[PDB]
Amino acid sequence: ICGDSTECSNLLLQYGSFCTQLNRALTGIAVEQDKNTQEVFAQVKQIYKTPPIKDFGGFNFSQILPDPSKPSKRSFIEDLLFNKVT
């Protein structure tokens, strides 16, 4: 609103505590976003690891199971998804 001007701040000061409410709403939104992500994904207590040998009765999970070559430890499908959307 004021852009670092003392006179504007002095004039705005007599409008009550609008800005505290405005900041409080945004802070609530941010905390809500963090809780959303945490409760969606953090569903397990331990980080399991796949065995080095992969013989699942003929099923082939290589396209989804993560690839160590990628620096982000992601998989093929996840890489495609991340590249597809801006």
Binding site: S5, E7, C8, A25, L26, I29, E32, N36, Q43
Partner: protein, 99 residues
């Protein structure tokens, strides 16, 4: 890999947020009935007693725009939270067991 435009929902969310920010920042260039849209020019041409009149218009316009933006953000956040709850239930039911 081949066909694109299969992720319309996430792209739409990103576009909505970007558009809201864009219009919010573009609103800064409106006179709201004053003589100029920049504070430094008003402060460098007019004495305070007549300057507060213009500054009041600037303040009220910008503040009203800010409140509109905040309300829209609140509504959108509520919708996203509902979607997140649905996603959490779907992961709990269809991944950790047979639905």
């Amino acid at each position: 890999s081949s066909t694109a435009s299969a992720l319309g929902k996430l792209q739409d969310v990103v576009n909505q947020n970007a558009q809201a920010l864009n219009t919010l920042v573009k609103q800064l260039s409106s006179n709201f009935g004053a003589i100029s849209s920049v504070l430094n020019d008003i402060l460098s041409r007019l004495d305070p007693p007549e300057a507060e009149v213009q500054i009041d218009r600037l303040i009220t316009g910008r503040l009203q725009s800010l409140q509109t933006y905040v309300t829209q953000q609140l509504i959108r956040a509520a919708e996203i939270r509902a979607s997140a709850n649905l996603a959490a239930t779907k992961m709990s039911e269809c991944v950790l067991g047979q639905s």
